[model samples]
Target: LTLKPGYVLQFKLNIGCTSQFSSTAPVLLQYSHDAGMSWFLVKEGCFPASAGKGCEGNSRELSEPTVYYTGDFEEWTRITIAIPRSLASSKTRFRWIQEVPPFGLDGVYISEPCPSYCSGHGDCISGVCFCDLGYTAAQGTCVSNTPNHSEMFDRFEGKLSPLWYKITGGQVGTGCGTLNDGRSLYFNGLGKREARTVPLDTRNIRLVQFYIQIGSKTSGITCIKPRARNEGLVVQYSNDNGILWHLLRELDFMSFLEPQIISIDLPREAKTPATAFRWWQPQHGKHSAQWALDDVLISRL
Candidate 1:
């Protein structure tokens, strides 16, 4: 079922036992708040078991399960649930059931803003965004950039940091590699991070270019969250003594492929105020495969 705003519902099933087959039949779970319309499968596990790889048929079980609104769903990020037959009772007499409150949205963690998290441009109270920018209502934080700043591209070949973190879980290596004290490069299964703030000199501003290598070797860790097939790299700029930040550009890459350069234009707004640069990775649901990276150099024209 499609769980739109204000959805309250549940599921129930019964099972019977037979000597020929197991009594348990997997119960498929899905939800739609658009009122019994569209359903997004949340998790699939046995009636008495939990969701996760190799989590079923375990000794322990869960009870009184409930899902509160995280208030994170959007039009593009619609909410849905999915349940498989492996998670239910197979017998005719035994039944599985699901229940929901009268309505959803209580005790939900709606994107609350931290105090001064958005800088003086806003105030965060009651986990809500209160704009201090004056031009906009108190709903979100202010967005700014250097007006007319050009972008740059880069690739690095030499061994800058020999201690590279392992990307593939199957091809095992150290969990995280060290960069240095003041500046460091950190990596998990999917992406990498560098702490050095990029200095955007106006003289060298142009179109920003970004590229990284990825591999096909899967991370065998079942509990590890797999990185998305389509990973995105983010470029953020901060001005005013690193007190505030503004997004400059974002680069998205295809999964399980060779290294390629992704390019995007830098907004003219970033030329004047941006002082620092930040690279970011998207948090995905699965561990990523083994990947290699090289040629990280920024070019200006």
Candidate 2:
């Protein structure tokens, strides 16, 4: 049967004569890479002349014949062998053959085969291939399915250099709590703290999506109540870097605890190649309000 690279084969063998003991019985495991034109030994198991239980012999490399012999079966024994990487192809085949009856009946079993072995890019789950986000199962393998003209901004690792600046009024850092992707851009509810991106090619873009979450204690606070409470998020875009920006959308996150997705259409004026976007939050006070942003995706129509 067709086998993926790095697959393993396992089986159970029971050998021993009920009334008449025979030591000449032999069981052999072999494989073929040339469509059955020729076969090479993979493993061998047999019952010895005088023994207590069945014994296995030495294994061989993929280039040479391997053998495993079980000497005289006393009970059931388990056997396992790994499929070599060199024999990992659709044309590879395997089989188990027995000599005479004295070796007794051999029990062979196998686990579920992986679908194209995740095409070497994903994982197998419940006999199905679960490919990565940008890959899809094709021809029994995981292949790239990512679209062109897409840009994504995630959490920072060691530095936030990808962003233009981290404008904050109180305190802002990579530490706050759990985030959707990685460490999110944290904000302390005081003054205006915003994060802006450098100029992006938005000429053919159509959608901009991101994840946002507000602190649980920020409930009942007015988002844009002038000087009383400036606790809201504003999405804006600028054509000339951060020189000037126009509002695209606003979100009142005062009553949010769980993360929420925000999707907005690219504004007509900001559909230029030099357009830049920013997420702004009005400061409320020192630790009075908190928010986070993550997974910003810009995709074309």
Candidate 3:
């Protein structure tokens, strides 16, 4: 309920059925977004009796899986199902229907967010932390873990979001003015405005990308001048949570009227436990120029 999409739902699953069987599927695990009004298979796999071990045209053995079963009947298989954002609706339900019967499901536990969040050091699965290579579990949680790698892509298709904080000016523009258009972070008015999208673990970030539309400067004004170009606009990242920033690229006098797609290699210094990017324009202009950035992405290979 109210959980962020992309988070996982994990549980201990142990099902028992004879290794050899004639049933199409002994049991079917299902989930419902509409309170069981309709059900969808969690995953599809035969309990037993596969075709000659696998598509041999005669049921013989089972196949490998993303949800692996234990070799021992007494052991539990760790299972994690990522919630589709559509079902973050908070009313989703799950069921394990007996298709053939006599299957055993022992002590079951479903825990979201994983115990102790794996102590913030290890990865979590079925209420447990497998842990990072260098760490170990303690009191049901791991004592250490590595930076969580994540990717980001925003097209600004919706209205301006608080997820993107305004340090100074621009807002989401309604029109995609250039060939790169759809919606974008737009600054149509005058004055210095700064802003950044939400933060994520960018320690593994390799590249950043975006499209920039450089409006136009005032009559008789030229951004090509060193001071003007230097004072224009720069894109940067914060390794210290905004206390300080390191420049990734400068767009003071970028050559373009149409949206120009730009890509920059991430600087090593920009990697940190928590990283975020911001577009900073030191000075705003009347005819100075209204600029926009769109389709921003900060990610790894």
Candidate closest to the true structure, highest TM-score: 3
TM-scores, all candidates, are 0.33, 0.42, 0.44
TM-score of 1: 0.33
Query: Candidate 1, which ten residues in sequence have the lowest lDDT sum?
Result: 71-80
lDDT of 2: 0.53
For candidate 1, give the lDDT of residue 214: 41
Q: lDDT tens string, model 2, 1-301? A: 7776556555556645332233344456677888687886653221111122222233211111233233323455444444555556556566666664434444353334555554334445435555657778876656557422335455554455454533333222433455576566676533335666756678788998877776643233422222223355667886544434566776765444657788898868978745677876543233345667766677784
Candidate 3 segments whose C-alpha is farther than 4 A from its true place: 1-149, 160-163, 174-176, 217-227, 285-287
Tell me the deviation in Å of residue 139 in model 1: 28
User: Residue-wise lDDT of candidate 1 within 1-301, one digit each (tens)?
Assistant: 1122222122222222211222122233343334343454433222221355434444322111222221111111111111223323221111123331112221222223343334333333444444433324323444344232334322232324222211111122222221111111223432122222433454445554544434323333322232453244445555421334456654443442444555545566655433455554433213333333333333465
**Model 3's TM-score against the true structure:** 0.44
Local accuracy by lDDT, each model: 0.33, 0.53, 0.53
Q: Please report how far candidate 2 places residue 273 from its true position, in Å.
A: 1.7
